[PDB]
Design a binder for this molecule. Structure first.
Ligand SMILES: [Cl-]
Length: 273
């Protein structure tokens, strides 16, 4: 992996990002969820790199990236991605994928950097903003995690993140996810929780998208359910919708080969030299 200070148009103008960059050819940037890190895309990065260049950063405040206290807006995270692409000399078009919060970041990127997208991959996410109670729950999480760390988040989220079959067949995946959460920097978690609370409604952005979009969801996703994601996909032009069997909210980890294949075959259609 690499760690580089990038220039970003978001406050504070420069930030150190840790990232993986594996493969050659057409660039695919994959954005993790909350409160995870780049390692949740490891299987896809290690497999797709035979055909694509796969870039997987830790977002600001997560993993090994710099922590910027306060509020980490989805826009700021998108600005950081643009700055990373600039650093790397990826100044033309990319495919951008995101899971959950990473999907929120992808919408912020599409809003601001439309001309840099060859395609979007939206996994286990939604375009609407937080409801008022959800916003308040962000704030409650932020205030507590600063002091207690993320153990209480792992306790609340793990049962909602993966399906029954994953608990049975893949306890090692459960434990990897748990360690991602437990290791997340407390102030990075807080800043992103507050940022998510203030993200805009992206509902009306979706019909205005100008690139092919793959929408992926676990069959048993308890957080962003398949019915809801299918309806979201119906609002996006040039969309393809895929349900991954025997996965919950984290298909890339729960059913890595299925996710890799779905992404690979779509990329072959979209992302050409
Ligand atoms: Cl957003």
């Amino acid at each position: 992996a690499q760690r580089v200070k990038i220039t970003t148009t978001a406050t504070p103008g420069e930030i150190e990002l840790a990232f993986e960059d594996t493969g050659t050819g057409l660039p695919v940037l994959l954005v993790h969820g909350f409160p995870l890190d780049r390692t949740m895309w490891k299987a896809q990065r290690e497999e797709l790199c035979d055909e694509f260049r796969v870039i997987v950063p830790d977002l600001r405040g997560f993993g090994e990236s710099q922590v910027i206290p306060g509020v980490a807006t989805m826009e700021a995270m998108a600005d950081d991605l643009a700055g990373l692409c600039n650093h790397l000399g990826l100044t033309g078009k990319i495919v951008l994928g995101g899971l959950s919060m990473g999907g929120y970041v992808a919408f912020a990127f599409a809003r601001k950097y439309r001309d840099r997208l060859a395609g979007l991959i939206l996994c286990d996410t939604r375009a609407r903003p937080d409801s008022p109670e959800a916003k308040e729950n962000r704030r409650r999480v932020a205030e507590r995690v600063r002091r207690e760390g993320p153990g209480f988040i792992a306790e609340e989220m793990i049962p909602r993140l993966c399906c029954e079959s994953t608990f049975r067949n893949h306890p090692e995946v459960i434990e990897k996810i748990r360690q991602m959460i437990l290791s997340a920097p407390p102030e990075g978690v807080a800043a992103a929780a507050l940022g998510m609370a203030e993200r805009p409604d992206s509902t009306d952005l979706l019909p205005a998208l100008s690139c092919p979009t793959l929408v992926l969801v676990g069959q048993f996703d308890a957080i962003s359910p398949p019915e809801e994601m299918e309806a979201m996909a119906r609002t996006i032009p040039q969309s393809q919708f895929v349900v991954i069997p025997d996965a919950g909210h984290l298909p890339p980890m729960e059913q890595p080969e299925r996710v890799t294949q779905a992404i690979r075959e779509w990329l072959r259609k979209v992302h050409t030299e």
